[PDB]
Ligand binder design. Sequence first.
Ligand SMILES: CCCSc1c(F)c(F)c(S(N)(=O)=O)c(F)c1F
Ligand SMILES: CCCSc1c(F)c(F)c(S(N)(=O)=O)c(F)c1F
Ligand SMILES: [Zn+2]
Ligand SMILES: [Zn+2]
Lengths: 261, 261
Amino acid sequence: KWTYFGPDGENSWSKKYPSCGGLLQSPIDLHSDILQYDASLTPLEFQGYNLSANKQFLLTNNGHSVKLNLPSDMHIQGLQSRYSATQLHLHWGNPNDPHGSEHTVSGQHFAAELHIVHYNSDLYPDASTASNKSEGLAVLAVLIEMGSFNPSYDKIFSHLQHVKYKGQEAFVPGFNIEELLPERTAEYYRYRGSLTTPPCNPTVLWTVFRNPVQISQEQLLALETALYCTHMDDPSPREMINNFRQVQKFDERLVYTSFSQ
Amino acid sequence: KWTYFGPDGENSWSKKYPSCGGLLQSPIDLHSDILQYDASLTPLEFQGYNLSANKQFLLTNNGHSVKLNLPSDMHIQGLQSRYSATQLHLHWGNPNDPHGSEHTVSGQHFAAELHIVHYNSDLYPDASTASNKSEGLAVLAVLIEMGSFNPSYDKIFSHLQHVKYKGQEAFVPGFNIEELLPERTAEYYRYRGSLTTPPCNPTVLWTVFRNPVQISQEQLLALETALYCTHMDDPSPREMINNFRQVQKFDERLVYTSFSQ
Ligand SMILES: CCCSc1c(F)c(F)c(S(N)(=O)=O)c(F)c1F
Ligand SMILES: CCCSc1c(F)c(F)c(S(N)(=O)=O)c(F)c1F
Ligand SMILES: [Zn+2]
Ligand SMILES: [Zn+2]
């Protein structure tokens, strides 16, 4: 299958996933020349993010990232349709170059990036059906930098020990996913783009929050060193690192901002 | 018929040109995490760069860039073989976004980039042979920023309305090519990489000078509006703009610097 390195890496995804060589590809560099304040971009409302402490949510190593399944009563309010959550996951670099966000800001990577994936549940029955359809998906992106310890991110990272290898699964008790969001969620970048992984469908409404979150140096190192892409029994193990796509060309287009200041 | 934009752009190159999806791809972002000083990287000497003004050298629009043919008596001294020149060419952006270098430094693009292409003439009889052999080619890269008018670059640019279309050829009087190089050529980045266009062979020893040169806004605009990828009779003309590849992953690779600091 597809990978982020070697022969099956991102320059080859378009052979078997043609949309990876098509229009509206993500991620992109967010830089001042292409930003345009749009007073119409009002705050999102995060509904059902306070997950029941009494419910468990499936965490998976899928060989590409670590993903947490989310329930479809969790949703964003504010967009043209209701977009219901389906999963969250992360992208990161490696300890020798700990700059593995997908989006960049003025050419600079952040340490990592969290994506909370939602689908248009007013139009489609599930995310897998929505993903290749018009208006199918909305992703929230949180940029992550090393700083202070983050107890909320640790509600996910304390389980990394149990999803070390591809295919492994663990259960995470519900917690308030809004705790993973940064300060001043009113401030964000917005643009139409794509999945950043195969099949790269150009069906994502992106919201990248302006302000990053922090996690400690030990948390970032844990994220970068805890997982493998490969199955446990693989005689040639591969660490799960550098699981981000390079930025894409983005020309004659704008990213709209909810902030002018 | 590869291009820099649209269906046949760079995410699709690897469909026809397998090395574009292979190892050792160029260009790259030059940033601190991947740099290491190497005291062995001693100064290059540029020999036979002062081309006779009474001779002329062929300028050709090859559908992807503009190239100036260079004589094989022009060479670099200081590498492990003699590398003789074959051609130079440029990469650039567009009038509304004059940010088209290939290499970036700490996430920033420069306005344009000059490549002076050499081949190992000790080992091979011509650059096309050398180009499919490891370390067969050595390319010098000069980063170009918007700044003062540059008379020396204008010795090339003044001939562009004469090679606007694919297949057209002009003659440029000899001049001193060293005038295209920046200050303190002793300061450079060195790494093993590839051609930045199809067929992307991983056969280039790159030298990117630390210091940029300047050309004016007017020179950039001329460059960015002069040229077409297509023939003069093509009913579907395409402007030669934005002819730079995105930066490539470079992990496990290190870039060696002839400067500490
Ligand atoms: C079918 C529903 C989830 S698949 C998926 C995905 F894996 C992503 F990485 C992304 S990403 N990285 O673009 O957020 C995504 F948007 C997705 F939709
Ligand atoms: C002998 C090789 C002919 S094709 C070629 C080239 F000459 C370059 F200089 C480059 S560059 N841009 O790497 O200098 C390139 F990409 C090419 F594909
Ligand atoms: Zn993602
Ligand atoms: Zn070039």
